[PDB]
Amino acid sequence: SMLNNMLITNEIKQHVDSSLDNFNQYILNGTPSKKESYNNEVILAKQKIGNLKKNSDDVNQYILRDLDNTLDSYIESSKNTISAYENKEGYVFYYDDFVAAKNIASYCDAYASTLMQNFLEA
Amino acid sequence: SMLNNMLITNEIKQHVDSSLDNFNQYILNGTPSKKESYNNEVILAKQKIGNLKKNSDDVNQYILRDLDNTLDSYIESSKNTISAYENKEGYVFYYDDFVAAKNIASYCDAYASTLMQNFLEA
Amino acid sequence: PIKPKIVLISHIKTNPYWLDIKAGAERAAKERGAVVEFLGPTTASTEDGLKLFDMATSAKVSGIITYVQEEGQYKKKINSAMEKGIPVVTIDSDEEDSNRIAYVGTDNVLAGQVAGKEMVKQIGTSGNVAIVMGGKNVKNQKERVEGFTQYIKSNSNLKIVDTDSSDAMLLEAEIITRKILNRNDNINALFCTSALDGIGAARAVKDLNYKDRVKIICFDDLDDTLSNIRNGLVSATIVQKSNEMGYRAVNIIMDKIEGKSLIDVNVINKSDV
Amino acid sequence: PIKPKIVLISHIKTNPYWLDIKAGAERAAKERGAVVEFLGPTTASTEDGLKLFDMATSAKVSGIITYVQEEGQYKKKINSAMEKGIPVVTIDSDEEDSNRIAYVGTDNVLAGQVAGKEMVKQIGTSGNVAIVMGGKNVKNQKERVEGFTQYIKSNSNLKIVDTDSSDAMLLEAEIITRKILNRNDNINALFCTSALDGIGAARAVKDLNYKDRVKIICFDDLDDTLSNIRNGLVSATIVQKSNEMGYRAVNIIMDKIEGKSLIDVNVINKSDV
Ligand SMILES: O[C@@H]1[C@@H](O)[C@H](O)OC[C@H]1O
Ligand SMILES: O[C@@H]1[C@@H](O)[C@H](O)OC[C@H]1O
């Protein structure tokens, strides 16, 4: 169980990482399957974070909320980037969003590894 | 066992983190017990990394070597900082070492969380 | 049940001044039913403070209370957070050109003028002064130096002969002071503008002797500073209500959350301690 | 058993030019009994490349092969690694003022001159040229533009009327080209100095038409560029031996490790493809 929780936590971290990677490739070349994978992987990270939130205790509750909200920020930054990109706008118009999406994805990684450590320590 | 390996990996990460924290406090105020704890915690991180290296496979071998060497770099940067500090030298003389010690400790954290994920995935 | 989380970002996390601000924040938070997350770098860095502010923004915390290290550098992130519905309070240095709901802290230019008035009382209207500041490009330090300089220029013939920086580090405060006393002939007084500067200066004066050819006016009421005042190494310190800053900032944040509706400085001398 | 690990740091990790360099490195590494770790940012960043270089230095890897984005910016970290016993090779842009054991890549100023000679063959000694470069402050781009400019100034009356940057991004190459064709009256030719610039320029020319009022001379032999040459949208491309760079760099590193002891550019036209 505590092991199942950190399996899920590791799955979330992989989803976020894979989502970012596909997102990056999509913005740099526009292969539609990259965007499809970007989208699928955040759907999965979002759902599994939701699943853990169902069974959270007093401490992880706070971290999960931060992680869930931070993922929403990533979703918003990456969607805004994709939107400007597909509108064929100047890089200057999505530079910030593009950067923030990378940064925010890295915050998600830190919440996830913190969670994994907490689950590890029953 | 794979669970024991990631317990150890988590212990290493905590040792490195705690070593950095005490190191930081020591440079900022000079409380001798902070330096003692800095030193004890890296001794423990070093030994346990050595222990995992004894039982490594084909892949973790490479990560463990990177982590072990990176810890040695942290040890060298933090000792050089402590040395200039205790000589009451100008900040300008240990600024780089002081910064590198923080940076290098963060590299150790990333190797450790990578290891923990690999152990998680038997 | 889950509580609102308020993020508090400090100049320097380990510093006993910020620990007092933290204590005040924890008191208010327990009273109001919030949790405080206390953050900050080890060595002063605007860049590091902004990354922490960015993390809290992304996490959509219930409120952010932030130190402002450099003028104009926080505006963008503060306004972005406000726009996203996160109430933002600035603490112990302000970003005036931003949409933060409130600033909780000292009027730092005024605090400088206050030091200037006390400096004139301490050594008179003629003589040489040297300044030790906690970072050359740090906002509330520049403001303190500004108020001080303005005051002694209007109300005396005191000459500022040397200004340098401790980067708000204790050891570096001693060293930069020792270096300032050397390299200057007749310094009558030191003005020290952040919490550890006075302690470091006292060490440098006691070590060269110059107790007492050199008076010290410094900032804050840290234990060793109060001790140096009793022992005569420091003549006056300018005291801030740090605990009250942390306390008031949390209550302003929680007031905004719940839809409900400049702190003086004090000169302390040996007779006061 | 454990193998030496060689770190390869690219300009841009996903780019098909660097993937070809990677392939060459993997070939040499398998032959020599090493492992290659292939790194790089998504968007070009000197800062990010230096952090990766710093990580490899700290990890005391057996060798580092690094791209150099900005002149003078890598010297400190390269020399520090060399001093710590890590053999360092620079690849597809050099840091001349550093103690790296070798540079493996194009003579970029020369490659620019080569483009300049081909530009004169393509449109003659009179006319207007515009330059699309992969980053205004990127070393080997500036070097290519330098060689080109020097050449056409010595050997023609061609006027460079506009220079702007794609930041080595494909979409931005198209857009900046479309913007350059607009805003300039009579442009006869485009010179494109990194791998994706030519593909983006061809898209912008085909879309406005201007096939063919505007010729394109670009860089590298990517599939779409070779295709644009066959279809007449691109007139010439300057081809580098990317695969050979990766191959040779690993062998130089492994030679140094084991204590054992400038690659030409080629113009390709439609008749060659
Ligand atoms: O900003 C703080 C300042 O108000 C105090 O004087 O010194 C410590 C600093 O961190
Ligand atoms: O530096 C590389 C350059 O040599 C090539 O022309 O374009 C791609 C760049 O990454």
PDB file of N, CA, C and O in Angstrom, chain A residues 58 61-63 65-67 69-73 76 96 103-104 106-107 110-111, chain C residues 1-5 35 37 50-51 54-62 76 84:
ATOM      1  N   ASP A  58      -2.868  13.838   6.830  1.00  0.00           N
ATOM      2  CA  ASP A  58      -2.746  15.245   7.238  1.00  0.00           C
ATOM      3  C   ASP A  58      -1.585  16.002   6.590  1.00  0.00           C
ATOM      4  O   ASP A  58      -1.686  17.203   6.358  1.00  0.00           O
ATOM      5  N   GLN A  61      -1.539  15.681   2.191  1.00  0.00           N
ATOM      6  CA  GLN A  61      -2.636  16.541   1.774  1.00  0.00           C
ATOM      7  C   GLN A  61      -2.146  17.886   1.224  1.00  0.00           C
ATOM      8  O   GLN A  61      -2.585  18.333   0.156  1.00  0.00           O
ATOM      9  N   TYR A  62      -1.242  18.522   1.972  1.00  0.00           N
ATOM     10  CA  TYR A  62      -0.672  19.828   1.622  1.00  0.00           C
ATOM     11  C   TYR A  62       0.232  19.761   0.404  1.00  0.00           C
ATOM     12  O   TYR A  62       0.192  20.646  -0.441  1.00  0.00           O
ATOM     13  N   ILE A  63       1.055  18.722   0.331  1.00  0.00           N
ATOM     14  CA  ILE A  63       1.955  18.530  -0.794  1.00  0.00           C
ATOM     15  C   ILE A  63       1.163  18.186  -2.057  1.00  0.00           C
ATOM     16  O   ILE A  63       1.486  18.654  -3.149  1.00  0.00           O
ATOM     17  N   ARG A  65      -1.965  18.957  -2.745  1.00  0.00           N
ATOM     18  CA  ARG A  65      -2.633  20.167  -3.200  1.00  0.00           C
ATOM     19  C   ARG A  65      -1.657  21.070  -3.972  1.00  0.00           C
ATOM     20  O   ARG A  65      -1.999  21.592  -5.021  1.00  0.00           O
ATOM     21  N   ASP A  66      -0.444  21.250  -3.454  1.00  0.00           N
ATOM     22  CA  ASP A  66       0.550  22.056  -4.163  1.00  0.00           C
ATOM     23  C   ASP A  66       0.889  21.444  -5.521  1.00  0.00           C
ATOM     24  O   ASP A  66       1.054  22.146  -6.513  1.00  0.00           O
ATOM     25  N   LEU A  67       1.025  20.125  -5.544  1.00  0.00           N
ATOM     26  CA  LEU A  67       1.390  19.431  -6.762  1.00  0.00           C
ATOM     27  C   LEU A  67       0.242  19.507  -7.786  1.00  0.00           C
ATOM     28  O   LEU A  67       0.461  19.773  -8.961  1.00  0.00           O
ATOM     29  N   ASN A  69      -2.254  21.763  -7.989  1.00  0.00           N
ATOM     30  CA  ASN A  69      -2.310  23.127  -8.499  1.00  0.00           C
ATOM     31  C   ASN A  69      -1.159  23.470  -9.430  1.00  0.00           C
ATOM     32  O   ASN A  69      -1.340  24.148 -10.422  1.00  0.00           O
ATOM     33  N   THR A  70       0.031  22.981  -9.118  1.00  0.00           N
ATOM     34  CA  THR A  70       1.191  23.281  -9.940  1.00  0.00           C
ATOM     35  C   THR A  70       1.041  22.607 -11.302  1.00  0.00           C
ATOM     36  O   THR A  70       1.413  23.175 -12.327  1.00  0.00           O
ATOM     37  N   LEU A  71       0.480  21.400 -11.324  1.00  0.00           N
ATOM     38  CA  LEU A  71       0.206  20.744 -12.601  1.00  0.00           C
ATOM     39  C   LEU A  71      -0.785  21.555 -13.428  1.00  0.00           C
ATOM     40  O   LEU A  71      -0.594  21.722 -14.636  1.00  0.00           O
ATOM     41  N   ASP A  72      -1.835  22.073 -12.791  1.00  0.00           N
ATOM     42  CA  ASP A  72      -2.786  22.926 -13.502  1.00  0.00           C
ATOM     43  C   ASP A  72      -2.068  24.130 -14.125  1.00  0.00           C
ATOM     44  O   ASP A  72      -2.419  24.555 -15.233  1.00  0.00           O
ATOM     45  N   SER A  73      -1.068  24.679 -13.423  1.00  0.00           N
ATOM     46  CA  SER A  73      -0.303  25.812 -13.963  1.00  0.00           C
ATOM     47  C   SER A  73       0.508  25.405 -15.183  1.00  0.00           C
ATOM     48  O   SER A  73       0.633  26.148 -16.143  1.00  0.00           O
ATOM     49  N   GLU A  76      -1.816  25.083 -18.053  1.00  0.00           N
ATOM     50  CA  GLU A  76      -2.197  26.387 -18.576  1.00  0.00           C
ATOM     51  C   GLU A  76      -1.066  27.011 -19.394  1.00  0.00           C
ATOM     52  O   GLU A  76      -1.311  27.565 -20.462  1.00  0.00           O
ATOM     53  N   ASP A  96       7.937  33.319 -22.800  1.00  0.00           N
ATOM     54  CA  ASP A  96       7.656  33.221 -21.365  1.00  0.00           C
ATOM     55  C   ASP A  96       6.868  31.965 -20.995  1.00  0.00           C
ATOM     56  O   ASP A  96       7.245  31.242 -20.079  1.00  0.00           O
ATOM     57  N   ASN A 103       9.825  25.213 -16.394  1.00  0.00           N
ATOM     58  CA  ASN A 103      10.061  25.503 -14.978  1.00  0.00           C
ATOM     59  C   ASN A 103       9.006  24.842 -14.123  1.00  0.00           C
ATOM     60  O   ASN A 103       9.321  24.208 -13.125  1.00  0.00           O
ATOM     61  N   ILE A 104       7.744  25.003 -14.507  1.00  0.00           N
ATOM     62  CA  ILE A 104       6.672  24.466 -13.688  1.00  0.00           C
ATOM     63  C   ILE A 104       6.722  22.937 -13.667  1.00  0.00           C
ATOM     64  O   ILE A 104       6.489  22.322 -12.632  1.00  0.00           O
ATOM     65  N   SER A 106       9.336  21.211 -13.703  1.00  0.00           N
ATOM     66  CA  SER A 106      10.391  20.859 -12.750  1.00  0.00           C
ATOM     67  C   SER A 106       9.903  20.987 -11.322  1.00  0.00           C
ATOM     68  O   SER A 106      10.291  20.188 -10.483  1.00  0.00           O
ATOM     69  N   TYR A 107       9.041  21.960 -11.027  1.00  0.00           N
ATOM     70  CA  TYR A 107       8.464  22.022  -9.674  1.00  0.00           C
ATOM     71  C   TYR A 107       7.678  20.745  -9.376  1.00  0.00           C
ATOM     72  O   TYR A 107       7.763  20.213  -8.267  1.00  0.00           O
ATOM     73  N   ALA A 110       9.829  17.933  -8.179  1.00  0.00           N
ATOM     74  CA  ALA A 110      10.271  18.048  -6.789  1.00  0.00           C
ATOM     75  C   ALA A 110       9.164  17.655  -5.808  1.00  0.00           C
ATOM     76  O   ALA A 110       9.438  17.001  -4.797  1.00  0.00           O
ATOM     77  N   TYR A 111       7.921  18.053  -6.085  1.00  0.00           N
ATOM     78  CA  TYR A 111       6.810  17.628  -5.225  1.00  0.00           C
ATOM     79  C   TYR A 111       6.698  16.098  -5.234  1.00  0.00           C
ATOM     80  O   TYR A 111       6.486  15.469  -4.202  1.00  0.00           O
TER      81      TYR A 111
ATOM     82  N   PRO C   1      -8.820  18.179   8.538  1.00  0.00           N
ATOM     83  CA  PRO C   1      -9.273  19.122   7.505  1.00  0.00           C
ATOM     84  C   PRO C   1      -8.102  19.973   7.011  1.00  0.00           C
ATOM     85  O   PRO C   1      -7.090  20.060   7.716  1.00  0.00           O
ATOM     86  N   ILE C   2      -8.218  20.579   5.830  1.00  0.00           N
ATOM     87  CA  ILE C   2      -7.068  21.279   5.257  1.00  0.00           C
ATOM     88  C   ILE C   2      -7.155  22.793   5.447  1.00  0.00           C
ATOM     89  O   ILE C   2      -8.220  23.400   5.313  1.00  0.00           O
ATOM     90  N   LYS C   3      -6.017  23.385   5.790  1.00  0.00           N
ATOM     91  CA  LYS C   3      -5.929  24.807   6.094  1.00  0.00           C
ATOM     92  C   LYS C   3      -5.331  25.596   4.926  1.00  0.00           C
ATOM     93  O   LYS C   3      -4.589  25.040   4.118  1.00  0.00           O
ATOM     94  N   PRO C   4      -5.639  26.901   4.843  1.00  0.00           N
ATOM     95  CA  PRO C   4      -4.962  27.746   3.859  1.00  0.00           C
ATOM     96  C   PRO C   4      -3.463  27.762   4.119  1.00  0.00           C
ATOM     97  O   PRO C   4      -3.046  27.754   5.273  1.00  0.00           O
ATOM     98  N   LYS C   5      -2.660  27.785   3.066  1.00  0.00           N
ATOM     99  CA  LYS C   5      -1.220  27.838   3.250  1.00  0.00           C
ATOM    100  C   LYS C   5      -0.672  29.173   2.790  1.00  0.00           C
ATOM    101  O   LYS C   5      -0.883  29.597   1.655  1.00  0.00           O
ATOM    102  N   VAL C  35      -1.619  27.777   7.892  1.00  0.00           N
ATOM    103  CA  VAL C  35      -0.295  27.198   8.020  1.00  0.00           C
ATOM    104  C   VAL C  35       0.671  28.123   7.275  1.00  0.00           C
ATOM    105  O   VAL C  35       0.330  28.652   6.214  1.00  0.00           O
ATOM    106  N   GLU C  37       4.345  28.456   5.425  1.00  0.00           N
ATOM    107  CA  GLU C  37       5.533  27.808   4.876  1.00  0.00           C
ATOM    108  C   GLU C  37       6.622  28.861   4.731  1.00  0.00           C
ATOM    109  O   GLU C  37       6.464  29.842   3.998  1.00  0.00           O
ATOM    110  N   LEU C  50      13.035  35.090  -6.271  1.00  0.00           N
ATOM    111  CA  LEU C  50      12.013  35.126  -7.310  1.00  0.00           C
ATOM    112  C   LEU C  50      11.596  33.719  -7.738  1.00  0.00           C
ATOM    113  O   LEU C  50      10.432  33.487  -8.051  1.00  0.00           O
ATOM    114  N   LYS C  51      12.541  32.781  -7.743  1.00  0.00           N
ATOM    115  CA  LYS C  51      12.198  31.406  -8.053  1.00  0.00           C
ATOM    116  C   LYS C  51      11.247  30.845  -7.008  1.00  0.00           C
ATOM    117  O   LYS C  51      10.262  30.211  -7.357  1.00  0.00           O
ATOM    118  N   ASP C  54       7.955  32.350  -7.658  1.00  0.00           N
ATOM    119  CA  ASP C  54       7.380  31.675  -8.813  1.00  0.00           C
ATOM    120  C   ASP C  54       6.777  30.303  -8.454  1.00  0.00           C
ATOM    121  O   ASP C  54       5.705  29.952  -8.951  1.00  0.00           O
ATOM    122  N   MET C  55       7.462  29.537  -7.596  1.00  0.00           N
ATOM    123  CA  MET C  55       6.958  28.235  -7.143  1.00  0.00           C
ATOM    124  C   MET C  55       5.632  28.386  -6.395  1.00  0.00           C
ATOM    125  O   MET C  55       4.683  27.634  -6.635  1.00  0.00           O
ATOM    126  N   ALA C  56       5.564  29.349  -5.484  1.00  0.00           N
ATOM    127  CA  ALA C  56       4.328  29.610  -4.741  1.00  0.00           C
ATOM    128  C   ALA C  56       3.202  30.066  -5.675  1.00  0.00           C
ATOM    129  O   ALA C  56       2.041  29.687  -5.515  1.00  0.00           O
ATOM    130  N   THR C  57       3.534  30.892  -6.654  1.00  0.00           N
ATOM    131  CA  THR C  57       2.524  31.320  -7.610  1.00  0.00           C
ATOM    132  C   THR C  57       1.967  30.106  -8.351  1.00  0.00           C
ATOM    133  O   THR C  57       0.767  29.918  -8.395  1.00  0.00           O
ATOM    134  N   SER C  58       2.850  29.251  -8.859  1.00  0.00           N
ATOM    135  CA  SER C  58       2.446  28.061  -9.594  1.00  0.00           C
ATOM    136  C   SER C  58       1.586  27.118  -8.762  1.00  0.00           C
ATOM    137  O   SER C  58       0.642  26.494  -9.269  1.00  0.00           O
ATOM    138  N   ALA C  59       1.902  27.042  -7.477  1.00  0.00           N
ATOM    139  CA  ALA C  59       1.202  26.168  -6.551  1.00  0.00           C
ATOM    140  C   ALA C  59      -0.126  26.794  -6.093  1.00  0.00           C
ATOM    141  O   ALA C  59      -0.904  26.177  -5.351  1.00  0.00           O
ATOM    142  N   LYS C  60      -0.370  28.021  -6.539  1.00  0.00           N
ATOM    143  CA  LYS C  60      -1.597  28.742  -6.211  1.00  0.00           C
ATOM    144  C   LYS C  60      -1.884  28.672  -4.723  1.00  0.00           C
ATOM    145  O   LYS C  60      -2.967  28.262  -4.315  1.00  0.00           O
ATOM    146  N   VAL C  61      -0.894  29.030  -3.909  1.00  0.00           N
ATOM    147  CA  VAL C  61      -1.080  29.066  -2.461  1.00  0.00           C
ATOM    148  C   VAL C  61      -2.098  30.151  -2.104  1.00  0.00           C
ATOM    149  O   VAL C  61      -2.428  31.003  -2.932  1.00  0.00           O
ATOM    150  N   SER C  62      -2.587  30.130  -0.872  1.00  0.00           N
ATOM    151  CA  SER C  62      -3.614  31.075  -0.451  1.00  0.00           C
ATOM    152  C   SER C  62      -3.095  32.496  -0.252  1.00  0.00           C
ATOM    153  O   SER C  62      -3.872  33.447  -0.258  1.00  0.00           O
ATOM    154  N   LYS C  76       6.921  42.372 -11.754  1.00  0.00           N
ATOM    155  CA  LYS C  76       6.330  41.440 -12.710  1.00  0.00           C
ATOM    156  C   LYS C  76       5.714  40.217 -12.015  1.00  0.00           C
ATOM    157  O   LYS C  76       4.551  39.889 -12.243  1.00  0.00           O
ATOM    158  N   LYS C  84      -3.669  36.454 -10.714  1.00  0.00           N
ATOM    159  CA  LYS C  84      -4.139  35.071 -10.614  1.00  0.00           C
ATOM    160  C   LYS C  84      -4.900  34.802  -9.326  1.00  0.00           C
ATOM    161  O   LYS C  84      -5.166  33.656  -8.983  1.00  0.00           O
TER     162      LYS C  84
END
